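ok so heres the complex, two chains, lmk if somethin looks off
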Amino acid sequence: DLTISSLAKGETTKAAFNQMVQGHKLPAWVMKGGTYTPAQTVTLGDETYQVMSACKPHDCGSQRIAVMWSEKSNQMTGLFSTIDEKTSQEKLTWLNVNDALSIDGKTVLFAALTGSLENHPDGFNFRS
Amino acid sequence: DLTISSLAKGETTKAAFNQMVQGHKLPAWVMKGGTYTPAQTVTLGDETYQVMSACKPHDCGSQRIAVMWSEKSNQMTGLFSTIDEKTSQEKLTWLNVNDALSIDGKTVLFAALTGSLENHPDGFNFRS
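and the predicted structre for the whole thing:
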């Protein structure tokens, strides 16, 4: 199955995944892609992506990640979120490296890691 | 017009607004609600809200806020975002005080302050 973890280990996707996280110092669990939500298909403008998410096993609500990957162009963008135990403040790290992400793409990644995308599989299609 | 600023000054909304921001030390511009996006109507489950947003004049992309207010119950929830000049990391502060916010409500507030809600006015209705 297509998960953040299989993308991180895949022969033809691993270097792209390593570039996406390059310089971001993300937790080991992301690559282990243990607890994950099934990939959903989302369309932005005139391109389609598989949007996936995953979170820290046994502390899922505290650390989570979302990735948007185009099976056609092999291109991927992501978002990492950590919630501070002390303030409940949420710190987001955008995994861009391409500067290709749009406002809707940011929203779709946030919907994925929060859980709205799973709850409304076809509610985040913004076609052109 | 209905804006975060009019809610902050309104006779019957100001105490609720002051409670929402209580203990959060937000910038002065929020109450001045200068640069704002028109209110949009959004339905979550079986309740409707006016979702509004605003941002820091002349540095709009750096500091922004979204608020969801029910004209019927006078209840409001919000989200403040600041983007670090140094890392581009985005820090979110949830204005809850009621613990009433759902996963979809978090998504709708994020869509509002990012701009997706304005670009897709009726694309964030999650009715029950």
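quick notes: The longest helix of chain B spans residues 103-114. thats all i got rn
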